[PDB]
Copies of this chain bind each other. A is one copy, B any other.
Amino acid sequence: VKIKIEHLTKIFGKRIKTALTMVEKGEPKNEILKKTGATVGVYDTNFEINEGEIFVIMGLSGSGKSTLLRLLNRLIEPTSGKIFIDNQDVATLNKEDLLQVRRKTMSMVFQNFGLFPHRTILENTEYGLEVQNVPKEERRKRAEKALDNANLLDFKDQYPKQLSGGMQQRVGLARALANDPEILLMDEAFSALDPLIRREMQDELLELQAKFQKTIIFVSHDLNEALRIGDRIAIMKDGKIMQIGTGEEILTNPANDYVKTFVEDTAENIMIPALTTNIDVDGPSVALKKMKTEEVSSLMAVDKKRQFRGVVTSEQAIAARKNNQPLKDVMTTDVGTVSKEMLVRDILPIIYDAPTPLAVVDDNGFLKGVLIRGSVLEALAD
């Protein structure tokens, strides 16, 4: 255990003593609002955290999650509650100690990376120490080190705006790490990047946490971004609906009825977007390029008029290429093609025969999607 929270909360607007007394009894948020006009962002929040225990915090825009972070850092003064870190409360600290804490223990990362465009990446990296009144030698040393640890040092002594979002994110992360903090607050950090860079950075962060075991408040509105890394998740709708974490307990034993609509817990609506190849125009080399980009081994084949035609395989394409032959001949028109609305145990005996999926072709030849073992899931749900 590292952190511990007690009846923490935060209230905005005015006439906040009445709202405090209200929440001291259990007054819902809407009623408090109507009666006082003091919008609440946090409500009787109680939980704890351990070391290396990445504690994601989910929710929708308005669940008042980033607010909880800025409270932990005390950037926003808590209306009430306590925060017992290292046997040291945080809401009852003077200015000096709070600053030393922010300098030693905690460090933040932000959505748009919170970078000073009027500086060089090195300077933005070392700021956390600059404000600690330390010599420039070790400042620059730790900076260069953290940057080498992110494989962008050479891009130093430049400015942010001339970089890519991913690089600036790595930069803010190095800025936060330089201090060797025991904690890392993150407010939808990777939410501004491309999903590809997003996954890359998720894995890099996991590698880091493996090397250095330090606690992390993460935040995000994407359940996958949490499940990939989260060791103990906490969902949030103006309150701790569920914080047990475990990743699955949220899915295994979702206590409330709103989490289950958040995680999206009988028809074959599972048809997924398909990967097409208009044989009438494109060729084997093109199909191979597509297989490469989409990162797959086969593809679906249609007509110039979007009419389903069949299936293609990597080897079939390579053979048509070597032979110089075209498509529409080296194909597999024999397929377990299916219709949009059927049972989950309909193509049960064939789904195993066809290694390739079973395209859900429209009645009129058109195509919608495919099925790859996502039918098994809901088929066994009965």
Which A residues are closer than 8 A to B by beta carbons? 195-196, 199-200, 203, 206-207, 210, 223-224, 227-228, 231, 246-248, 251-252, 263, 272-273, 276, 281-286, 288-293, 295-297, 304-306, 314-315, 318, 322, 355, 366, 372-374, 376-377, 380
Whole-angstrom CA separation of A380 from B284 in the bound complex: 14
A221 to chain B, nearest CB (A): 15
Whole-angstrom CA separation of A290 from B247 in the bound complex: 12
Whole-angstrom CA separation of A112 from B272 in the bound complex: 28
Q: Do A373 and B297 have beta carbons less than 8 Å apart?
A: yes
Contact of A372 among B251, B289, B295, B322 (CB under 8 A): B295
Return the chain B residue nearest A381 by Cβ. Answer: B318
Q: Do B314 and A283 have beta carbons less than 8 Å apart?
A: no
Known A200-B273, A273-B200, A306-B207; judge A283-B252 contact (CB<8 A): yes
A149 to chain B, nearest CB (A): 16
Nearest 8 CB-CB pairs, A to B? A297-B373, A248-B283, A314-B373, A248-B285, A251-B285, A210-B306, A247-B282, A247-B286
Complex contacts, A293 vs chain B, CB 8 Å: 224
Whole-angstrom CA separation of A288 from B236 in the bound complex: 23
Q: Do B199 and A273 have beta carbons less than 8 Å apart?
A: yes
Return the chain B residue nearest A367 by Cβ. Answer: B203
Number of chain copies forming the complex: 2
Complex contacts, A196 vs chain B, CB 8 Å: 273
Complex contacts, A246 vs chain B, CB 8 Å: 281, 283
Q: Do B227 and A286 have beta carbons less than 8 Å apart?
A: yes
Whole-angstrom CA separation of A227 from B293 in the bound complex: 11
28 residue pairs of the A-B complex, CB under 8 angstroms, read A196-B273, A199-B273, A206-B306, A210-B304, A210-B305, A223-B289, A224-B293, A227-B286, A227-B289, A231-B281, A246-B281, A246-B283, A247-B281, A247-B286, A248-B282, A248-B283, A248-B285, A251-B289, A291-B374, A291-B377, A292-B374, A295-B374, A297-B372, A297-B373, A314-B376, A314-B377, A318-B376, A322-B380
Complex contacts, A285 vs chain B, CB 8 Å: 248, 251-252
Complex contacts, A374 vs chain B, CB 8 Å: 291-292, 295
Whole-angstrom CA separation of A372 from B288 in the bound complex: 12
Complex contacts, A297 vs chain B, CB 8 Å: 372-373
Whole-angstrom CA separation of A315 from B374 in the bound complex: 10
Complex contacts, A203 vs chain B, CB 8 Å: 273, 276
Complex contacts, A284 vs chain B, CB 8 Å: 248
Whole-angstrom CA separation of A273 from B206 in the bound complex: 14
Complex contacts, A376 vs chain B, CB 8 Å: 314-315, 318
Complex contacts, A305 vs chain B, CB 8 Å: 210
Whole-angstrom CA separation of A337 from B355 in the bound complex: 22
Q: Do A377 and B318 have beta carbons less than 8 Å apart?
A: yes
Complex contacts, A322 vs chain B, CB 8 Å: 380
A202 to chain B, nearest CB (A): 9
Q: Do B247 and A283 have beta carbons less than 8 Å apart?
A: yes
Complex contacts, A282 vs chain B, CB 8 Å: 227, 247-248
Complex contacts, A251 vs chain B, CB 8 Å: 285-286, 289
Q: Do B373 and A291 have beta carbons less than 8 Å apart?
A: yes
